[PDB]
Write a protein that binds this DNA or RNA. Sequence first.
RNA 1: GUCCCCACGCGUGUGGGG
Length: 204
Amino acid sequence: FQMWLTKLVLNPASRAARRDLANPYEMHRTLSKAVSRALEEGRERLLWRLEPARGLEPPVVLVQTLTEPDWSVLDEGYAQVFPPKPFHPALKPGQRLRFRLRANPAKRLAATGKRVALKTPAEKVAWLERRLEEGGFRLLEGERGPWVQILQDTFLEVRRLLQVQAVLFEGRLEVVDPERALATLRRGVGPGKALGLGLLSVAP
RNA sequence: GUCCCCACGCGUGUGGGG
């Protein structure tokens, strides 16, 4: 009942890597290969994130898996694989953690039956604040507002046309219910979990 | 500027029968 974290530094000289970097769907098919058997048996929840490019340095993909991944299934010269390490998220009540989450703040419009993205930063934060509170977490806050800043807001258009709003959050949260908090980290947060969203990363 | 599928809420009713 633990987790695995893998750091994949992709090689921009690879044609397979450039393809997967442009297409979150093609990245999803490639990353699924490492835990192909566990997904076939329906006991795996794959979560990944393309880390924000600080510039200069190569693309970094962080992959979280419930079962141990076998990264020998990647193409030759695809990525520099940093060995997967067992992740025990030992959480106590009232513990405060720095978090990073690229997610899809959206709502199911009842007039259309469709799922559309939220527009204002005020309701994007309100969405995050709701999802964390439902998942046993709670956003810390000062007197200006909640402890979170939106760093990226890009409208993704995956050609398999999949259209998902990708919002990158970063700030500080608190653990209220550690049992709920453990499950939230394992499940992920919000839609588009296959397309590189949902992965909630926590650090002290 | 949400493309497809599955499950399920909240609020408020319409019409018929005895």
